[PDB]
Amino acid sequence: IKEMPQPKTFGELKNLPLLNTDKPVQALMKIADELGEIFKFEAPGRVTRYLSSQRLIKEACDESRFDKNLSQALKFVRDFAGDGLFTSWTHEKNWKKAHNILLPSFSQQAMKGYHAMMVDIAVQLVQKWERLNADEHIEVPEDMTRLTLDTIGLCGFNYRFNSFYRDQPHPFITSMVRALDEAMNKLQRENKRQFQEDIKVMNDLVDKIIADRKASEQSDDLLTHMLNGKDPETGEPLDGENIRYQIITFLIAGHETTSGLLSFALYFLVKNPHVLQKAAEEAARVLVDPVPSYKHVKQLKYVGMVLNEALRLWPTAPAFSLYAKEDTVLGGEYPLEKGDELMVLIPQLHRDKTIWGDDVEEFRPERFENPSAIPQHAFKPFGNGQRACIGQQFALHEATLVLGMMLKHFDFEDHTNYELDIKETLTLKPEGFVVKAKSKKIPLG
Amino acid sequence: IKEMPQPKTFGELKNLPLLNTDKPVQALMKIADELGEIFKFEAPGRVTRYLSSQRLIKEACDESRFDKNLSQALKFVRDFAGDGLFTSWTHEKNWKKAHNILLPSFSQQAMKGYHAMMVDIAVQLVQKWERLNADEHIEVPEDMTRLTLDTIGLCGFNYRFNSFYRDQPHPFITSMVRALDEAMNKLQRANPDDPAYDENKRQFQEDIKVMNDLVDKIIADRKASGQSDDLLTHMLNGKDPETGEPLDGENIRYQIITFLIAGHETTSGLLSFALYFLVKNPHVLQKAAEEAARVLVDPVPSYKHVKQLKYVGMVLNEALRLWPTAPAFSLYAKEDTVLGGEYPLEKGDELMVLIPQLHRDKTIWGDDVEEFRPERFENPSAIPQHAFKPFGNGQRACIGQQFALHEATLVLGMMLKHFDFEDHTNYELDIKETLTLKPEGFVVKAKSKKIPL
Ligand code: HEM
Ligand code: HEM
Numbered sequence A: 001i002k003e004m005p006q007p008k009t010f011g012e013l014k015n016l017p018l019l020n021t022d023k024p025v026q027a028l029m030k031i032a033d034e035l036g037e038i039f040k041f042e043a044p045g046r047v048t049r050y051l052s053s054q055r056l057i058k059e060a061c062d063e064s065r066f067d068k069n070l071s072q073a074l075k076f077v078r079d080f081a082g083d084g085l086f087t088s089w090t091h092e093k094n095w096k097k098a099h100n101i102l103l104p105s106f107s108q109q110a111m112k113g114y115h116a117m118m119v120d121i122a123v124q125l126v127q128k129w130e131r132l133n134a135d136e137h138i139e140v141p142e143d144m145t146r147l148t149l150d151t152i153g154l155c156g157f158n159y160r161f162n163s164f165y166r167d168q169p170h171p172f173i174t175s176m177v178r179a180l181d182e183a184m185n186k187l188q189r190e191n192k193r194q195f196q197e198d199i200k201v202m203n204d205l206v207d208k209i210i211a212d213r214k215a216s217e218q219s220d221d222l223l224t225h226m227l228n229g230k231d232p233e234t235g236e237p238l239d240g241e242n243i244r245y246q247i248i249t250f251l252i253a254g255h256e257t258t259s260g261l262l263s264f265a266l267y268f269l270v271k272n273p274h275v276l277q278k279a280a281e282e283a284a285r286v287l288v289d290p291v292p293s294y295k296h297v298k299q300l301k302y303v304g305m306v307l308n309e310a311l312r313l314w315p316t317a318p319a320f321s322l323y324a325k326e327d328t329v330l331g332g333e334y335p336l337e338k339g340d341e342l343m344v345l346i347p348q349l350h351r352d353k354t355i356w357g358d359d360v361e362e363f364r365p366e367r368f369e370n371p372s373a374i375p376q377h378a379f380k381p382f383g384n385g386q387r388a389c390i391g392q393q394f395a396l397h398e399a400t401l402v403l404g405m406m407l408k409h410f411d412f413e414d415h416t417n418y419e420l421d422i423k424e425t426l427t428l429k430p431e432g433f434v435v436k437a438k439s440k441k442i443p444l445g
Numbered sequence B: 001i002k003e004m005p006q007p008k009t010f011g012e013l014k015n016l017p018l019l020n021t022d023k024p025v026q027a028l029m030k031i032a033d034e035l036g037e038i039f040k041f042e043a044p045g046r047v048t049r050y051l052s053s054q055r056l057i058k059e060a061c062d063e064s065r066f067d068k069n070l071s072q073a074l075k076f077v078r079d080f081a082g083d084g085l086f087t088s089w090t091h092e093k094n095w096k097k098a099h100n101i102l103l104p105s106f107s108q109q110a111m112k113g114y115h116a117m118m119v120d121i122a123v124q125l126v127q128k129w130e131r132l133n134a135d136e137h138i139e140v141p142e143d144m145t146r147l148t149l150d151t152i153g154l155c156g157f158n159y160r161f162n163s164f165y166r167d168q169p170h171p172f173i174t175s176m177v178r179a180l181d182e183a184m185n186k187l188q189r190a191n192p193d194d195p196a197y198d199e200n201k202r203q204f205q206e207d208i209k210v211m212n213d214l215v216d217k218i219i220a221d222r223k224a225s226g227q228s229d230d231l232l233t234h235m236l237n238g239k240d241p242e243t244g245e246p247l248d249g250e251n252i253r254y255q256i257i258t259f260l261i262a263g264h265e266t267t268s269g270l271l272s273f274a275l276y277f278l279v280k281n282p283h284v285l286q287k288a289a290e291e292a293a294r295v296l297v298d299p300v301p302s303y304k305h306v307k308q309l310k311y312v313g314m315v316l317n318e319a320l321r322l323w324p325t326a327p328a329f330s331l332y333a334k335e336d337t338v339l340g341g342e343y344p345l346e347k348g349d350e351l352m353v354l355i356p357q358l359h360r361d362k363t364i365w366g367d368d369v370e371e372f373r374p375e376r377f378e379n380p381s382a383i384p385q386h387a388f389k390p391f392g393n394g395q396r397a398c399i400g401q402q403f404a405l406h407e408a409t410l411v412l413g414m415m416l417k418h419f420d421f422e423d424h425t426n427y428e429l430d431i432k433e434t435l436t437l438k439p440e441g442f443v444v445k446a447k448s449k450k451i452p453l
């Protein structure tokens, strides 16, 4: 049995003044660097324990002992995402209900169904970059957000945000980003009703999506299942309020982290030109049709390894929370009472040298040549167990398709020798990452 | 010999107070409705004579007697367009020089070469409209400007403005519109050096600077590349067969500005008006769409097929009849002479062809000149000479007329092939003037016919 580490507290404020940054996850990583595999963190009214080692997170991922918790961050996100799948408790009726109803929308059958629409948006990205003049450059996370938002809008809701027809972010994005940034800042605390205004912009958009569906054509997408699908357990469909919450939930969770992933993957590729070369070689060899087929995207194995290694270094959803189901001893050293909260600090987990070796900071896609020769619970960018990411296959198929087309159609240049600056909005993304792309002059479909 | 009519004068201000409007051409049309085929118009320091009848304009277009004049409007535009082709005198060395050097860019060879690029931009317009959601609409002159600006940028300079990637107007457009507007408004200032107005002129200089920054970008993108054969290639490399000389750098910059403006603004206006008249005349719309569907049989239009869109072309010509988007041009008298056997003119005297009013000459077109009927152009060689002048006259006529008409026929054809249109607001025609003419606030909804590209 051991006493759990905790950084300095300042009376009433507890550990809160130790963040005081626009980069709380990276700050918590520094704290983990100093204090080790586990430390307690208190804020006024709340307490949690940050885990950073595979040996402990392995235990935390045991669902007989720990269940998904709503961290304070997620409690703030619940103000607009409600009891949608991301921000609901496992024991809430609508969690299992919505999970059962929406899981078929992520069957491989459904993926094959989404592919043509993903290609629609991907082609828009490629054409945008084909049409740049020589003195121009690419704003990478901005365009990746254009792509991923449009993709979830079309595939999921037959709604076109038309982000590439705008040189500024879509209104939905501006409000979403401000709302997420506000939840994040609020963790460290007029902002108030600016928040309500951003929520209202997002909900107005949901209104537009529902109205566009009802005013139409036979459909079979995510929204079709939200509106009509029945839970096999209870026989019930989702009610209107939960449907609205699921739409918000999927529009946000369904694009933000994928944008981050494509941005980090391109970053690491232009910073490791031999790895870039291997990936481009694969894209050119596999993607032989004028636009990619589903079956060919499944063959992009090195590109998929590149994406996994980007997720290892900077998991764009960088933490998840658990609570203790019953009194127990964690790791045989740390006693926990029922209700006690844990935070998995994923980037730090992914730098556990006892698992990955001493060169954890290098970008080596080949770490994933044999993806489950990797020890249990060493790699958790998509969370855990029955509460793991429902959209993982969607995300990786989209990102593999898109990164594949990018590598097929252009040579990329890190023309500014960009210094990595990671912006935090609960999620992570490179900020200010820009490149130049030289077309290989290969025609589309 | 007859005394020439002139509307009311106001003490030193002369006829100026009869305008005082952001719609001066429409006002001159009302004045012409009152005074007839010709009237003198004086402002402080200047005088011109507005012509509205074919019988007089036929004489004005005789180049043995009259040559192109730089009107005050064009002298104001010359502040940023310099001695480019549009704003130079016929007998300026750089006019003939630039004419000889640049005319080859409008040969049929060259047009056939531009077709794929025009299709590139047209396809972008069609895709934008295909991708609108059910609750949305189209801002017509805005999207026509996106299309026409991009088309001259690409065909002329291998430069992509990427206007369809922006939800507001391109910066170049905002500055161009403000500069043209300033040129227009300045014509009606009694005392232009009044403090409120030189406070005003700062913006003019700023807008000229934006347009020139864009020129800098076009030149640098061309210089940074290693093979072309467009308008810019001829600007940079062509030599005048007469003098042996190339254009100098300064004149090249003026030409780039000139073609970026003249090469898109009036074509945007034309497509906008044409669509307006089509939705206001659904029978004509139906006929034109039938022609488009029958003719444009390939997944994207061929050069040869656009030429077969004869009714579409008639539609465009009738739009130009009712609202010629370059609505006037100016002439001077080469020597003392008599106009129409009634009106004496001295060397130097100016004439202005008031083109929309000419285009409403009932002795030429019949009594229903206000109605939209494309069939007016079925046999154009029965139309009297100089009855129809949307592209100016003689050796100073529009160098881009075929370019413009091919572009607009292609684009309007694809629009009619791919969508049914709805005048969902029952739009009330509002014509904005910036020297040139264009509908303002014109919006429609388009329902896709779901035909692939
Ligand atoms: C690279 C992209 C993505 C990453 C890194 C990611 C990460 C995660 C993580 C860590 C969780 C668990 C959160 C927790 O335990 O509190 C989660 C859950 C979830 N994600 Fe993803 N996600 C990604 C893409 C997507 C996409 C594209 C969608 C939708 C199409 C999506 C929808 C969801 C939903 C609905 C949940 C809640 C699942 C449930 O509890 O039933 N995600 N994601
Ligand atoms: C509907 C479209 C257009 C209309 C109605 C139009 C109208 C005119 C008119 C009326 C003139 C004579 C002006 C005067 O006498 O003062 C002119 C000249 C000119 N136009 Fe067009 N224009 C159009 C399209 C274009 C295009 C697409 C281009 C370039 C690609 C172009 C380039 C020019 C140039 C350079 C001149 C000056 C010619 C010279 O004097 O050498 N125009 N235009």
Ligand SMILES: CCCCCCCCCCCCCCCC(=O)NCC(=O)O
Pocket: B024, B025, B071, B072, B073, B074, B077, B081, B086, B087, B187, B257, B258, B261, B262, B325, B326, B327, B328, B329, B435, B436
């Ligand atoms: C570089 C080309 C710029 C395009 C400008 C095209 C101008 C369109 C025709 C000019 C219209 C002039 C008529 C406006 C009112 C008027 O009274 N003008 C007389 C005058 O300015 O002297």
